[PDB]
Design a protein around this ligand. Structure first.
Ligand SMILES: N[C@@H](CC(=O)O)C(=O)O
Ligand SMILES: N[C@@H](CC(=O)O)C(=O)O
Ligand SMILES: N[C@@H](CC(=O)O)C(=O)O
Ligand SMILES: N[C@@H](CC(=O)O)C(=O)O
Lengths: 330, 318, 330, 318
């Protein structure tokens, strides 16, 4: 008997992991500049753990991530599932938490899908990207990683795609699953998993994007003192399918915003209450009678995460109570 | 001789601490031990949910504290928790009275099991009565902790421990009616700022737009079309902008709208010298000021100047 | 059909939850002074949710918790399992994280066992104990709480007995599962569970204390700069069955401590390396050759938690590799 | 004119940053960009794993910095991460040079993927070269953050982000070779302390005992039997003691041993006025000093006084 290593496919999309600047010790850089081959060759130990094939899907900053790249990724992974043993997606950190949840809801492939990025560009002193990439490959190669949904691997930690969020603007340790914690930690190329997400993911969801050319239009409005209703009116005037509110506190709304959203809701615009507050649920049965206004409470989904689920909910139903049930199950 | 207690004024604005329905007099009467530490007088300013806080109320409060500073030894403001962090920083920048100003709220209703409001109110008075609390800026006192009004933010939607100074930490902790202060904010506040709202009846209009994958430019454009004085971007990561939002804001910054890049990310600074050439576009980087805190400072900046470089310096000093 | 509420048994042991002082606004108080009936009557809403029966097992500060109280609790719960639908144990906060893990490893009852305490005495302004008790009863009454091991409920949060730890000396929010997160959050008397512990617990462990009169002797030594080997020598001289080291960093030992523990280990004293560092695992394959010295690495178990598992491991085996396997499974 | 760079001295002590095997000269030569910010000179003090740090090394370091203060513009100490928090606070209390003293280490070996040591060393030099870093006490620089030597502690066994000032927060963050300081420690340090180790060759013996359910009194008794000068208790919760440990320590405190109650709990103060009457027993409460930090302060306290009340006041001031 001979040892054979798993086959792992790297789908590259850009990010600071592929960023470069002209100095190792200045901060300035350009994103999504370096190709997948360069990233792979910067981690010569990858041969110890996997047979790696790299594909460049796009090369962008994830600040410019969009619905089309999401559809491209989901369809590619679902199509290519039988060709490989696992996937790593290199991506910008800014919207990784959004792409990861989208994929968590739409990947039907039963093989690990692991997202990874870097907070320092590839050119920087002590760049984090090479070890992050190694650890993402370790996770994608570990049989125990299966059936846990779509994962994010950053800073030696395996995080579920639903709860994971970027907590700090600059810190290499930025990614945390702030409400329910990580799934496992990586030490010396091994993972000790102690958790798995309960919410339904991947092959257990009804969302099937195989034939979609686009996704429903869902925007986000922010609340604060003296908030303008103009953003909300703009989305309503454009015929948006859904609006997510980044509420204050427990999903609360400035009154003018509340008035515009209540009206939209009774015309069939889906309205989800989420929170600008970085941890905790936007609950039912607090200060807003959701049943009365036809609103949906986001639970622990932050506004950008709630957008992901709402867009997908709107491919199935426009009924607020059915949308609320979706927000209680996925 | 005869022992004497400080005179503390409670300015009530509403909130769950008053659940925004119970009056200042009932709040006070419900914590009879306040008599052990101060001579409390209450005045009702408004009685609202802080999700409906607004510029008018802010102006009322700053004017009242500045006017009444001589009459009292310190102030406590009872407020909703939802926008307490905004009001705190507004007052931090506009209050000229060097005597303690302490804001407090509650996460649980006064009738709920283990309501937090009573002890929160007690400790806010302790803080307002402590001579060591002077000259530290406007404060927030919650969950046995004294927090500076610049850094303090609501971190959790329901936890009594929600309020934290997430970038630089608290100033001190309160135990047995005493505070051990170990920090003070270095940014200029109160009487060391140029902001003076004594004669203003309105504040520059400043709105906030959110960034996310596939973000619409419609919110940003709606603010521009209404002639907003300023727009704060709740950027992704280190204050980055979705392309269409970036395009709209680039235009606004050369067309009479001040533009500040902040971040939806809950901790850390939005820096210069990363991916965005702020100088080229005429944008301002917010540093550790989150979008709603950056709005506050940007409205006050626009009372002095419309020049992006002078705005950037304000954002580096206050 | 008529609604019937679950039967819940409160086993009271003391703590600040049962503490009292002479003023509502001074900090001074005496622990474990108030009886179970008083605690129950301070939460008049408990009738809305359960039929509550209180038993006083002991009335102590949990700083004086000990092996005999642990054995008493485990045997009582296992004996009385069929008499009730769920248990709440009122307890001091100082060692709750130790009792909870002991119970997590030794309870064979398939009904929820929920531990609760209070950081402020019963006499204090804004005392946390009454709502903590309510929420513990809610958790013990929820069918979904079953099969999750022994739980700790504090500050609106349901925490697993293994990972839970006291993080702050004074804060009502002190209890966190610092490595893997909470299992669920409580809002308006309802729990949305999103996690369950993977490590084996309760009826899935081999530990059976039904007939034990005592537990193996296990002590803890602390490392720091210029550490004394005298504590370690004292435990060895007394014939201790086990010693847990609160190491520096990743389970590292001051050399004189290391020398004494290496010697003890080769005479059959079990030696577990843990860490004084509050989060993260004490790993294998770092600076200490555990295989060589016959040591066991504690993983994420902190020193007092590692003591619990080691005592129980020593009821089954004295073999270091079998003990290491136990530390990898429970 | 001609631009001039500060002179910075690296004092090397070992650690994973040197993995304790590589010499100061290789460390320095591996970050050639240090030349852009300083004139670096290195000196080897020892080359050890900091799990074997000891009083002798502490005394060497304090004496060397105090002696060499005039010769340089700032210091960086390369050190293991395991006891860096102890050495930092020792130096914080004993260094009399008001010029920046910055400690640094690394969580990953220099040969590992994405090793942290190089940028950590670069930023430690930035900090040591910043004129704004003077008069803030001894510092720890890790993961782009400037932390005070009193509050800083290792929070995680392996994370590069492990070091945090868990009670009062960091002093500033480092970005693009610049620091925005927003805090400074209020406790007295360096030249405002009475501790002077210039002529000492040994320090008072102080040991640490741990509390847990069913704790043995054997460790505490072993320290007492050896005539230890002081014992720090790593208490449960708010510095509480298992009965048998409490009994032994009560006796020690009246029998020539200073006793400080600290806590195994990683954050928060061990306070007076909770369950233990410190005055009655002659114990000292540690405040926010964890057991190993309390040991440091208690050894230095015992160089001035053996009186528990004077020790308590030291613990309230430094
Ligand atoms: N703007 C970059 C930031 C990063 O990757 O860290 C991106 O998200 O693509
Ligand atoms: N919505 C309430 C929440 C609270 O006070 O806790 C307020 O901000 O007025
Ligand atoms: N010493 C008390 C502290 C508390 O319960 O909060 C105990 O653990 O019993
Ligand atoms: N044991 C090493 C750990 C490190 O430096 O990271 C030391 O403290 O010397």
């Amino acid at each position: 008997h001979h040892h054979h290593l798993p086959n792992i496919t790297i789908l590259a999309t850009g990010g600071t992991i592929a960023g470069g600047g002209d100095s190792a010790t200045k901060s300035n850089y350009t994103v999504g500049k370096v190709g997948v081959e360069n990233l792979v060759n910067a981690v010569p130990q990858l041969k110890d753990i996997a047979n790696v094939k790299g594909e460049q899907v796009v090369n962008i900053g994830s600040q410019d991530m969009n619905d089309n790249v999401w559809l491209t990724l989901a369809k590619k992974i679902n199509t290519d599932c039988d060709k490989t043993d696992g996937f790593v997606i290199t991506h910008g950190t800014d919207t990784m938490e959004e792409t990861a949840y989208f994929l968590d809801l739409t990947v039907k492939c039963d093989k690990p899908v692991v997202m990874v990025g870097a907070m320092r560009p590839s050119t920087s002193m002590s760049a984090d990207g090479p070890f992050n990439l190694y650890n993402a490959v370790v996770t994608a190669a570990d049989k125990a990683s299966a059936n846990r949904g779509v994962l994010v691997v950053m800073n030696d930690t395996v995080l579920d795609g639903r709860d994971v969020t970027k907590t700090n603007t600059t810190d290499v340790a930025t990614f945390k699953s702030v409400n329910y914690g990580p799934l496992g930690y990586i030490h010396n190329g091994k993972i000790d998993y102690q958790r798995t997400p309960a919410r339904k993911h991947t092959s257990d969801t009804p969302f099937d994007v195989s034939k979609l050319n686009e996704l429903p239009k869902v925007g986000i409005v922010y609340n604060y003192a003296n908030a303008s209703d103009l953003p909300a009116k703009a989305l309503v005037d454009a015929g948006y399918d859904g609006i997510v509110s980044a509420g204050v506190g427990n999903g609360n709304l400035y009154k003018s915003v509340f008035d515009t959203l209540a009206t939209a809701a009774k015309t069939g615009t889906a309205v989800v209450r989420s929170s600008r507050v970085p941890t905790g649920a936007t609950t039912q049965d607090a200060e807003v009678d959701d049943a009365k206004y036809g609103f949906v409470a986001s639970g622990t989904l932050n506004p950008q995460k709630a957008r992901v689920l709402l867009q997908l909910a709107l491919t199935q139903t426009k009924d607020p109570q059915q949308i609320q049930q979706i927000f209680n199950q996925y």
